[PDB]
Design an enzyme around this catalytic site. Structure first.
Site, short mmCIF file in Angstrom:
data_model
loop_
_atom_site.label_atom_id
_atom_site.label_comp_id
_atom_site.label_asym_id
_atom_site.label_seq_id
_atom_site.Cartn_x
_atom_site.Cartn_y
_atom_site.Cartn_z
N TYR A 115 0.81 -1.19 0.00
CA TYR A 115 0.00 0.00 0.00
C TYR A 115 0.85 1.24 0.00
O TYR A 115 0.52 2.19 -0.67
CB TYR A 115 -0.94 0.01 1.20
CG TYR A 115 -2.18 -0.87 1.11
CD1 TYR A 115 -2.53 -1.71 2.15
CD2 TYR A 115 -2.99 -0.85 -0.01
CE1 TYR A 115 -3.66 -2.49 2.09
CE2 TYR A 115 -4.12 -1.64 -0.09
CZ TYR A 115 -4.45 -2.46 0.97
OH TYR A 115 -5.60 -3.22 0.88
N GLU A 167 -8.75 -8.08 0.79
CA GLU A 167 -9.13 -7.65 2.15
C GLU A 167 -10.46 -8.22 2.61
O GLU A 167 -10.57 -8.71 3.72
CB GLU A 167 -9.07 -6.13 2.31
CG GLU A 167 -7.77 -5.56 1.86
CD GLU A 167 -6.62 -5.82 2.82
OE1 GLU A 167 -6.75 -6.65 3.74
OE2 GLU A 167 -5.56 -5.17 2.67
N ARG A 170 -10.25 -11.74 3.70
CA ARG A 170 -9.63 -11.86 5.02
C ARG A 170 -10.56 -11.48 6.16
O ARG A 170 -10.48 -12.09 7.23
CB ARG A 170 -8.38 -10.98 5.14
CG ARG A 170 -7.31 -11.19 4.10
CD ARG A 170 -6.42 -9.97 4.06
NE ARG A 170 -5.16 -10.23 3.37
CZ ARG A 170 -4.61 -9.45 2.45
NH1 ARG A 170 -5.19 -8.31 2.10
NH2 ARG A 170 -3.47 -9.79 1.90
#
Ligand SMILES: *[C@@H]1O[C@H](CO)[C@@H](O[C@@H]2O[C@@H](CO)[C@@H](O)[C@@H](O)[C@@H]2NC(C)=O)[C@H](O)[C@@H]1NC(C)=O
Ligand SMILES: *[C@@H]1O[C@H](CO)[C@@H](O[C@@H]2O[C@@H](CO)[C@@H](O)[C@H](O)[C@H]2NC(C)=O)[C@H](O)[C@@H]1NC(C)=O
Ligand code: XYP
Length: 518
Positions: A115, A167, A170
């Site tokens: 990121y 994401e 997860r």
């Protein structure tokens, strides 16, 4: 099993969950440490089986954008757009990643998939990019074209895509956020909870894996709430952990210590949020162990080292049972150098502290402060429920369930009504003893009318019994379990207008999924 697809074309809350769920199922190795799925170890996966291809679609089609997703960490390491393949720069050239898409372009960006890099190149942060169907619809288009004179927007686009796929895989928390984008067709910015989940994904896996048997962390992991309030996580059993769908591989539990087995010193909270306390701070042999408010200072009489030999220790002495009979009291006593059986306990992740020699459990037969604890017949009552960890204040939040609706307190009744932020009836206190309490009435509990009856409507009643029907466990399943029942919380016939949340065997999915919101 190689290719999972998702399309924007007429996308529903269901079909996004089906997609996310399908990607979770192939990313899962059969292993399930502490009850949470973990991914396969790199040194275990042959280069041949090292990738899932994620095929994303769109309105402005006509061939899909295919991402190469590493099964090891859910990284998007490359993507395809026809004959052309685009790769992310990497800190350690892997044999597998190069040769991944042969018979193809091969271009590499000058940035990594991280990121810090993507934001850098994108020229904005994660908290500044809108997420949702439209953003994904644009991100897909822009990754289709793959205009190398653009690139700022390619990196922006990968930020949209990684967040909305990897994401979400997860965390059920962020999966929830996108479902709400699809239901209300309203784009959203990543809130500080979602950013902290994404930031602490690695740490959370590490904490959970390297925890003791019982799921107590050696160090808390610091998360965030929506609004920037700190959330401290001290065990697998913390209710927020239930939203952690799938972990990175760190190690296997017991140049690499398979997994540490630490001996953490923590508070133990249970019944009514009170703490396991050595009465009056006195350590003479035979002196009772009681209920008492949690002190948040560092007085030694509320701190327990959970040792590997199965003893539980405060100061120098051991938590000990006075005898092996229903009704006998628990006390502080000397630890022996053979180490006796009246001083050994398993502290289970679900929240039971059991003395193995007698099969009797740590209980609080009485809800008030100074009540003497008590080995009892295990009936998995809340009275008999416990949680290791130093952050002892009940977590306060919304419980989202079927159709992204929220549990709401209505006098003596509970049922799921449409979520609305000002709550306050929609706020719930998740107690250390397994009970769910209305924010504004902490004497009352989320209770089964009759725990023995399947189909029994769950009501709000006095916590005073501390019964079987007053302990609930938020499961990685996404269900709310009753231990003792084996039964789950359930919205009658997937019909919210019946105003009935009941007790029911595990189905089938959707009307039985719940998330304690972070
Ligand atoms: C147990 O709780 C206390 C914090 O309340 C921590 O332990 C202390 O830390 C230092 C100070 O030098 C050390 O000297 C100790 O040995 C000390 N007190 C004792 C005897 O526990 C520690 O953070 C533990 N908490 C956590 C996070 O698990
Ligand atoms: C978590 O909750 C369980 C209640 O079902 C407790 O007991 C364990 O459950 C059994 C079946 O689920 C069994 O497989 C186990 O072995 C049993 N405990 C042991 C170690 O024998 C207990 O709270 C559970 N254990 C954990 C993971 O903490
Ligand atoms: O509780 C003890 C604390 O007082 C001190 O730090 O010494 C070791 C700890 O176990």
């Amino acid at each position: 099993y190689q290719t999972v697809t998702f399309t924007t074309k007429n996308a529903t809350k269901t079909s996004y969950t089906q997609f996310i769920e399908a990607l979770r199922a192939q990313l899962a190795s059969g292993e399930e440490p502490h009850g949470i799925p973990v991914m396969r170890e790199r040194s275990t996966v042959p280069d041949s089986k090292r990738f899932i291809l994620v095929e994303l679609s769109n309105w402005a089609a006509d061939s899909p954008v295919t991402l190469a997703v590493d099964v090891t960490n859910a990284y998007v390491v490359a993507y395809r757009t026809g004959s052309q393949s685009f790769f992310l720069r990497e800190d350690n050239p892997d044999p597998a990643i190069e040769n991944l898409l042969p018979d193809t372009k091969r271009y590499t960006f000058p940035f990594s998939g991280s990121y810090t890099d993507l934001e850098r190149v994108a020229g904005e942060r994660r908290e500044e990019i809108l997420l949702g169907m439209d953003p994904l619809e644009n991100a897909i288009s822009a990754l289709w074209i793959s205009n190398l004179n653009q690139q700022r927007a390619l990196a922006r686009s990968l930020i949209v895509v990684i967040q909305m796929v990897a994401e979400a895989v997860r965390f059920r928390f962020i999966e929830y956020r996108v479902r709400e984008s699809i239901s209300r067709a309203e784009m959203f910015r990543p809130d500080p909870a979602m950013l902290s989940l994404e930031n602490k994904w690695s740490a959370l896996s590490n904490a959970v894996q390297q925890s003791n048997q019982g799921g107590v962390f050696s160090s808390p992991v610091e998360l965030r709430s929506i609004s920037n309030k700190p959330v401290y996580v001290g065990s697998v059993s913390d209710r927020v952990i239930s939203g952690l769908a799938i972990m990175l591989f760190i190690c296997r539990s017991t140049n690499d210590d398979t997994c540490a087995d630490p001996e953490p010193t923590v508070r133990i909270s249970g019944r009514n949020g009170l703490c396991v306390r050595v009465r009056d701070g006195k350590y003479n042999n035979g002196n009772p162990i009681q209920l008492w408010p949690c002190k948040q200072n560092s007085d030694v009489n509320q701190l327990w080292t959970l040792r590997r030999d199965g003893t539980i220790r405060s100061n120098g002495k051991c938590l000990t049972t006075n005898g092996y009979s229903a009704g006998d009291y628990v006390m502080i006593y000397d630890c022996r150098t053979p180490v006796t059986a009246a001083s050994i306990w398993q502290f289970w992740a679900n929240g039971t502290i059991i003395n193995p020699q007698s099969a009797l459990v740590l209980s609080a037969e009485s809800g008030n402060p100074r009540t003497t604890l008590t080995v009892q017949a295990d009936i998995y009552a809340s009275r008999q429920g416990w949680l290791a960890g130093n952050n002892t204040e009940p977590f306060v939040t919304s419980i989202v369930g079927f159709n992204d609706l929220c549990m709401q307190a209505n006098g003596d009744a509970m049922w799921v009504v449409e979520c609305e932020s000002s709550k306050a009836e929609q706020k719930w206190a998740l107690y250390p003893d397994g009970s769910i309490r209305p924010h504004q009435d902490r004497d009352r509990c989320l209770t089964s009318t009759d725990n023995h009856s399947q189909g029994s409507i769950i009501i709000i009643s006095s916590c005073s019994p501390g019964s079987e029907g007053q302990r609930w466990v938020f499961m990685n399943d996404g269900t709310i379990l009753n231990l003792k029942n084996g039964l789950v919380m359930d919205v009658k016939g997937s019909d919210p207008s019946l105003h009935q949340i009941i007790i029911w065997p595990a189905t089938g999915k959707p009307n039985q999924k719940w998330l304690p919101l972070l």
